[PDB]
Design a binder for this molecule. Structure first.
Ligand SMILES: CCCCCCCCCCCCCCCCCC(=O)OC[C@H](COP(=O)(O)OCCN)OC(=O)CCCCCCCCCCCCCCCCC
Ligand SMILES: CCCCCCCCCCCCCCCCCC(=O)OC[C@H](COP(=O)(O)OCCN)OC(=O)CCCCCCCCCCCCCCCCC
Ligand SMILES: CCCCCCCCCCCCCCCCCCCC
Ligand SMILES: CCCCCCCCCCCCCCCCCCCC
Lengths: 54, 101, 476, 100, 162
């Protein structure tokens, strides 16, 4: 039951999570200038709202 | 005041009479009578006009208050106009300000 | 206006006179060698004249400008970045069939804007310095406009930087509407008794944060960075990544130092979230990158996140300014060497049609010393000890521990581990197996070798850099 | 007699209109037009702020803003001319080769 | 004063709304020129006489002339864009519109809670603007000359034919 070293796999889990998160984040780098402007305006909205709620 | 509001009224009437005269002229023209790829040099010239127009606005603001700025203002306007003429010489010498090659 | 104030202005005057002289020399004849030499002579002269400005002292040259040792340190970093850019640009521009001389004029004018941002003490001077480093970068990013990727990067950077300039200008206008004074020290002066967090002041600072965080590649204003870095010419990528980031973060450092609204808790929390997201996202997006330009763009996002972590600890700590100085020296040398190795392997410019892929795999077996420099900078940007990048990481960790910024400290550790993965992947790919000849290319190799030796020497022995950064003090 | 808030709100309305025109349009020319709208709105806000306090600084910042607007319009229209020369269309979505 | 300010602000808003939705480029530029004339009228209402004169001279009289020149040069008539009208259907613009509306309402909330003693409207002449511009702001003047120089150099380098 232990021959595959389960503790090593459970400690290897954060590497899998990092690879999945990086692959998911790289989808936003689609190369569209209009989406880049849209993301700038979205970030402006988020920053302004965060500054207003404190 | 009185003279300033009289002049405001006169200027507004001048505006509306001129515009109405032109529009009435075209309306009467339409009424009366019986019926039956450009080169980049244009862009460059217009762009040069824009840049030197903004620099001209700086000189416009300089020219009004000469006797309130002293000799330091003359010095600063002198570096301003020197960079102006340096850019003009740069444009002329490379062929930017020549319609024909 | 005093003549000592004229002594405080010498980097600005020397760079402007170099601009005029190089422009007139181009107007006389188009000589790449002579105009490039005149440009590097003017930049070297301004770097030398920083000593005379240091002997002049420290004073407020205008309601706009203020010069102290803080400003001279930032001016020196910007001038060194510009000199390295010109040195990398000459073997690059040797292959450029169009006019090779406008490059140096734009580089010099951008260095002038960097100097203005180094010395800026005023919203007008900050806006002017931002625009003076931006518009020549519009020209330089698309200097090879016939190349498809360079034209794409030029259009992207121009549109997005015009939008960010509009955001920054609108925020400045709202701040001036509240305050009635464009001086840095008056941004929050008319408030008091706990009424520091005025909503219009905070929203104006938020719009300025949007513009400057675009300029600093901070998440979520970061998506332009890999595309613009990949599409731009490699010396232009070097100049952007070093000079633009250093000058704008220096002026942001100064703005948050003297503005009384810099002690607002809301801006601190927003900048903490931005720093956290920048570190994590920039490290995570560079995991699976086979292109060194995009990888270095994501790396720049993470490193500006670390710098922002050092920025948040400004008011609570005391060593925050020194931390920013030491980190910026290490980052300048590291990014200079990295993008320089990329530049000399991308030199000469092969044309608009041919690919400009780096192909770092197997670099040691045909070009070994540059491979050694490249892996040294990979270790330095990873923050590994024996490198000055570690010394900067240690300073950032010290100011995060002293200010009890535990979330940002944990972000630094986790993003450091992810960075270790991708940086070590690049550094070991340099020594795997894969399937110039003038003195200017040798000068570029000299520049990257010198920067690598400096980062190694100040990794093992960091005390001179610490002492000379501590020598710089502002007019508090 | 004129509130400062009304001038600031008018500038904000023009700014967000320019941002909307920047985002929604595929043609690069209308993107440049929206950029001009946003920078003119920012300059207008600076004029309103300077006029409220009775200072010249608002008009000076207006002059700096329109200098920037002239420079950016020049550079953007040069880039648009280059795009129309190379690709014979002004679709900004086709300029999307770099990604990842 | 207030009366001209409010009509000119309303005209500027309406003209900008026609700008960002129109399909014909020359018509959109004409609406943009109208909005610039209105913004200059707003400047003249505030007392910034130099700013209004510059809004006509520099913005409408130079920059929009450059845009009009470029549009006439390219002969733009909707190359598979007017035939599509992608920006008109709500499934395209419904996102950016509400995003800009949210940003606008946050900015307006920030504006609504400030000190407002009212704009006097006393004319700040171009002579005083010149005294300030060549008094405390001379480094701004010089570096703006270099700014326009940089823009000119960039625009010539990019906008050639060969
Ligand atoms: C016991 C709990 C209490 C003590 C905790 C102590 C924490 C520090 C010490 C332990 C660190 C554990 C790190 C585990 C992952 C190590 C990296 C690794 O395994 O990399 C291998 C893998 C690549 O190999 P391969 O599977 O072939 O993938 C092909 C790639 N295309 O690589 C990849 O696939 C990508 C690797 C990305 C970078 C590594 C992951 C970093 C994640 C954050 C680490 C920091 C600690 C966070 C908390 C961990 C859990 C407690
Ligand atoms: C009539 C109903 C609407 C009809 C459709 C729209 C027509 C155009 C409306 C806008 C332009 C006119 C606005 C009304 C101006 C009337 C005169 C006025 O109110 O003057 C007051 C003031 C005088 O100056 P001041 O010394 O400050 O006096 C204040 C009190 N002592 O004046 C000032 O301070 C400045 C005066 C205004 C600025 C100069 C004129 C600007 C013109 C802008 C035109 C914009 C484009 C129009 C396009 C039309 C088609 C859409
Ligand atoms: C820790 C600080 C940096 C230390 C030096 C890092 C490496 C620099 C380059 C030194 C020379 C490398 C030579 C590698 C030879 C590999 C041969 C492999 C044979 C299978
Ligand atoms: C993904 C990054 C995770 C970073 C974890 C940092 C943990 C910080 C804990 C702070 C606790 C403060 C208690 C008061």
């Amino acid at each position: 039951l232990l021959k595959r070293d389960p503790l090593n796999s459970m400690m290897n889990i954060p590497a899998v999570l990092s690879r999945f998160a990086g692959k998911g984040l790289l989808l936003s780098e689609n190369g569209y200038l209009r989406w880049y402007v849209a993301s700038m305006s979205i970030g402006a909205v988020v920053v302004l709202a965060l500054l207003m709620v404190l | 005041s009185t003279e300033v509001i009289a002049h405001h009224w006169a200027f507004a009437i001048f505006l509306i009479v001129a515009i109405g005269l032109c529009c009435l002229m075209l309306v009467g023209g339409w009424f009366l009578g019986g019926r039956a790829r450009l080169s980049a040099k244009f862009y460059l010239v217009a762009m040069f006009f824009v840049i030197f127009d903004v620099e001209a606005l700086y000189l416009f603001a300089w020219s009004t208050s000469i006797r309130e700025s002293g000799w330091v203002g003359f010095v600063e306007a002198a570096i301003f106009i020197f960079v102006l003429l340096a850019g003009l010489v740069y444009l002329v010498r490379i062929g930017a300000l020549d319609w024909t090659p | 206006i005093t003549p000592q104030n004229l002594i405080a202005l010498l980097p600005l005057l020397i760079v402007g006179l170099t601009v005029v002289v190089v422009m007139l020399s181009i107007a006389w004849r188009r000589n790449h060698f002579l105009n490039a030499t005149l440009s590097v002579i003017g930049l070297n002269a301004a770097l030398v004249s920083l000593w005379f400005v240091g002997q002049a002292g420290a004073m407020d040259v205008t309601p706009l400008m203020r010069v102290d040792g803080f400003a001279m340190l930032y001016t020196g970093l910007v001038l060194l970045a510009s000199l390295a850019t010109c040195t990398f640009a000459y073997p690059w521009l040797e292959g450029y069939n169009d006019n090779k001389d406008e490059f140096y004029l734009l580089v010099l004018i951008a260095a002038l804007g960097g100097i203005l941002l180094a010395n800026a003490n005023h919203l007008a001077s900050l806006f002017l310095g931002i625009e003076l480093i931006s518009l020549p970068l519009f020209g330089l990013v698309g200097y090879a406009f016939r190349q498809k990727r360079s034209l794409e990067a030029s259009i992207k950077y121009t549109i997005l930087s015009a939008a960010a300039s509009s955001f920054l200008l609108f925020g400045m206008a709202l701040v001036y509407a509240q305050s009635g004074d464009l001086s840095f020290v008056a941004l929050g002066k008319n408030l008091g008794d706990g009424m520091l967090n005025e909503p219009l002041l905070l929203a104006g600072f938020g719009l300025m944060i949007v513009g400057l965080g675009f300029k600093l590649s901070l998440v979520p204003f970061h998506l332009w960075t890999p595309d613009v870095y990949q599409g731009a010419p490699a010396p232009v990528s070097t100049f952007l990544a070093t000079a633009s980031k250093i000058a704008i973060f220096g002026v942001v450092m100064r703005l948050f130092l003297y503005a009384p609204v810099g002690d607002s808790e809301a801006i601190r929390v927003v900048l903490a979230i931005i720093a956290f997201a920048s570190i994590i996202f920039g490290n995570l997006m560079a995991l699976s990158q086979t292109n060194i330009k995009r990888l270095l763009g994501y790396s720049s996002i993470s490193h500006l996140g670390y710098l922002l972590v050092a920025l948040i600890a400004l008011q609570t700590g005391e060593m925050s300014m020194e931390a920013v100085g030491v980190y910026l020296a290490g980052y300048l040398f590291s990014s200079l060497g990295a993008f320089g190795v990329v530049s000399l392997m991308s030199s000469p410019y092969r044309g608009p049609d041919a690919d400009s892929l780096f192909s770092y795999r197997g670099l040691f077996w045909h070009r070994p010393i540059l491979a050694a420099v490249m892996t040294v900078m990979m270790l330095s940007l990873a923050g590994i000890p024996m490198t000055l990048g570690f010394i900067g990481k240690f300073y950032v960790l010290a100011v995060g521990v002293q200010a009890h910024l535990w979330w940002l400290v944990g972000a630094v550790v986790v993003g450091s581990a992810i960075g270790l993965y991708y940086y070590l992947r690049v550094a070991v790919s340099l020594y795997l197996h894969a399937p110039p000849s003038n003195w200017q290319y040798s000068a570029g190799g000299i520049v990257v070798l010198i920067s690598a030796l400096l980062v190694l020497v100040l990794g093992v022995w960091p005390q001179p850099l610490i002492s000379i950064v501590r020598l710089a003090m502002p007019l508090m | 007699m004129i509130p400062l808030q009304h001038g600031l709100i008018l500038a904000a309305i023009l700014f967000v209109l320019g941002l909307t025109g920047l985002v929604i349009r595929r043609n690069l020319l209308f993107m440049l037009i929206g950029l001009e709208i946003m920078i003119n709105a920012s300059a207008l806000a600076f004029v309103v702020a300077g006029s409220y306090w009775g200072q010249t600084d608002g008009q000076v910042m207006y002059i700096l803003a329109i200098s920037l607007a002239a420079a950016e319009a020049s550079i953007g229209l040069a880039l648009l001319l280059q795009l129309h020369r190379r690709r014979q269309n002004l679709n900004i979505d086709s300029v999307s080769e770099m990604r990842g | 004063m207030e009366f001209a300010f409010y009509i000119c602000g309303l005209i500027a808003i309406l003209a900008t709304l026609r700008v960002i939705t129109h399909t014909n480029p020359v018509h959109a530029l004409l609406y943009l020129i109208i909005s610039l004339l209105a913004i200059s009228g707003v400047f003249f209402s505030l007392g910034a006489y130099f700013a209004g004169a510059l809004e006509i001279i520099v913005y409408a009289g130079a920059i929009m002339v450059l845009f009009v020149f470029v549009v006439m040069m390219l002969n733009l008539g909707g190359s598979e864009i007017e035939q599509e009208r992608q920006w008109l259907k709500p499934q395209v613009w419904i996102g950016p519109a509400i995003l800009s509306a949210i940003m606008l309402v946050v900015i307006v909330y920030a504006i609504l809670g400030v000190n407002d003693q009212g704009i006097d409207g006393t004319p700040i002449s171009a002579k005083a603007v010149g005294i300030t511009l060549f008094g405390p702001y001379v480094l701004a003047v010089e570096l703006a000359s270099m700014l326009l120089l940089a823009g000119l150099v960039v625009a010539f380098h990019v906008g050639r034919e060969e």
